[PDB]
Amino acid sequence: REIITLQLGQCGNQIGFEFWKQLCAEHGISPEAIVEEFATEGTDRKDVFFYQADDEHYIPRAVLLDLEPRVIHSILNSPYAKLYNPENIYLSEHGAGNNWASGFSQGEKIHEDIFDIIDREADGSDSLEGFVLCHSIAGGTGSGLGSYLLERLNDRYPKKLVQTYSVFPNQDEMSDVVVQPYNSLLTLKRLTQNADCLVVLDNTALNRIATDRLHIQNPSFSQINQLVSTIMSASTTTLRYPGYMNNDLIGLIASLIPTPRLHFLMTGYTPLTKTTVLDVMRRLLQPKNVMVSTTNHCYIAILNIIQGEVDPTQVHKSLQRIRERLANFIPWGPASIQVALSRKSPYLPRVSGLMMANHTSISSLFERTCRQYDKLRKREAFLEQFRKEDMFKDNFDEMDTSREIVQQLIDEYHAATRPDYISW
């Protein structure tokens, strides 16, 4: 079951690039897309993310879109320039200029060009499972164009799953672009209504990790994106190897998200700074290892992907300790903790783990966005550029509607922490 990856704007294209470089390494594929001599056979399944053009040639099922040339041009001048399908790269002359409404309106104008690439890649798939969107929620392209695409995919491919990797801004990034709470809230509306699973990538927490744990003072996007490609790579493990019948994309979502509307996941990772499976799983629960910055709140579900050689007789003990001890779960159903045992790629130069968690404290992130938006909105601050666009020419009803949809999301999260979430 194929997955098509859509990369939007500076952020989405820059994190997409690291993700595909990482997958190439793992799947024994060269920067030019040619099977490595040592990798003619393997345990891995390339079919999901890569198209097989030849016996020896592999192309990413990836669509690259931006409204500015910079990032796509960097990629086309890199050692990985030949990897991507040149017909899958779209670049618009016309930027989104840090404005959601401009990015969104630009989507409308460039619809047919975008979906000539998407439709072709979809119709070229034997059994398409769904789409992965990589983007920032705070800029102009990843927010506006991303939001346009989410609505369009919902109508054009109603039976396909949409998973996103959505980057939430830093405080430094928030203060630099004053309209970000608007772009963010507007994007959160489509992430709430038009995505099946959203992996929250939080620049605040990612920066904190790079400084406190990796000891990198003043971390660049390149360095931050190393942690990002690690999450994205680790979280697609069960899709990239055979034998995880219960954890194809449909299966992953079902277990992590038994609550359809509460589909925002946070990630944990170890080692960030002799090790057993008990240690790895204990570490994944430590707040300092959790990659979003957020009593009462609880786990809806946990999936630990554990990579490396482990004593599998000890997995029960680790899981059970977590149920009966660090980990607070929903009061209206059983504790849902699952493990997927994996081995590290033999092509790579140790035991590690990724936690994918559905935790209600994620709402505090959306609460913050709502507070920053309210401070601006209730002074009609910085709305002039939005007004110049079609969606906001007459009024800001689209904003008031986004605001209420995100409030309904937040309300459901708090309600999920209580036994009365189910009236029985």
Ligand X SMILES: Nc1nc2c(ncn2[C@@H]2O[C@H](COP(=O)(O)OP(=O)(O)O)[C@@H](O)[C@H]2O)c(=O)[nH]1
Among 60, 139, 219, 268, the residue binding ligand X under the rule CB under 6 A is 139
**Contact predicate 166/200, CB 8 Å:** yes
Residue 151-180 contact track with ligand X, rule CB under 6 A, x = bound:
----------------x-xx--x-------
> 285 CB contacts (<8 Å, ≥6 apart)?
268, 322, 326, 327, 355
Q: Is 143 annotated as a binding residue?
A: yes
Q: Give the number of other CB atoms < 10 A from CB of residue 250.
A: 13
Q: Which tokens in the block code for residue 214?
A: 């990796």
**For residue 298, which of 263, 258, 330, 335 has the smallest C-alpha distance?**
330
DSSP secondary structure, 388-422, as one string: TSGGGSS--HHHHHHHHHHHHHHHHHHHTTSGGGS
Q: Which tokens in the block code for residue 141?
A: 């392209």
Q: Which does 127 bind (CB under 5 to 8 A by kind): ligand X, a second copy, none?
A: a second copy
Q: Is 140 annotated as a binding residue?
A: yes
Can you tell me the distance from the alpha carbon of 181 to that of 378, in angstroms, rounded to the nearest whole number?
A: 13
Q: Which does 139 bind (CB under 5 to 8 A by kind): a second copy, ligand X, none?
A: ligand X
Q: At 65, which amino acid appears?
A: L
Binding site residues, a second copy, CB under 8 A: 1, 127, 159, 242-243, 245-246, 248, 250-251, 253-255, 257-261, 312-313, 315-317, 319-320, 323-324, 332-336, 338-339, 341, 408, 412, 415, 421-424
Instruction: Determine if 147 is a binding residue for ligand X (CB under 6 A).
Output: no
Please report how close the Cβ of residue 163 comes to a second copy at its closest, in angstroms. Answer: 13
Please report how close the Cβ of residue 371 comes to ligand X at its closest, in angstroms. Answer: 17
Q: Which does 99 bind (CB under 5 to 8 A by kind): a second copy, ligand X, none?
A: none
Q: Which is nearer to a second copy, 177 or 341 (CB)?
A: 341
Q: Is 40 annotated as a binding residue?
A: no
Can you tell me the distance from the alpha carbon of 248 to that of 80, in angstroms, rounded to the nearest whole number?
A: 28
Q: Is 144 annotated as a binding residue?
A: yes
- Secondary structure letter of residue 29 according to DSSP: B
The reply to whether omega before 219 is within 30° of 0 (cis) is no
Q: Is 335 annotated as a binding residue?
A: no
State which of positions 204-223 bind ligand X (CB under 6 A): 221
Q: Which is nearer to a second copy, 94 or 261 (CB)?
A: 261
Q: Which does 333 bind (CB under 5 to 8 A by kind): a second copy, ligand X, none?
A: a second copy
Q: Which does 273 bind (CB under 5 to 8 A by kind): ligand X, a second copy, none?
A: none
Sign (positive/negative) of CA torsion 407, 409, 414, 418? positive
How would you label 134-156 residue by residue, b for 16+ Cβ within 10 Å and e otherwise? bbbbbbbbbbbbbbbbbbbbeee
**For residue 262, which of 391, 337, 360 has the smallest C-alpha distance?**
360
Please report how close the Cβ of residue 160 comes to a second copy at its closest, in angstroms. Answer: 11
Among 7, 85, 136, 318, the residue binding ligand X under the rule CB under 6 A is 136
Residue 57-96 contact track with ligand X, rule CB under 6 A, x = bound:
---------------------------------------x
Annotated binding site for GTP: 138-144
Annotated binding site: 138-144
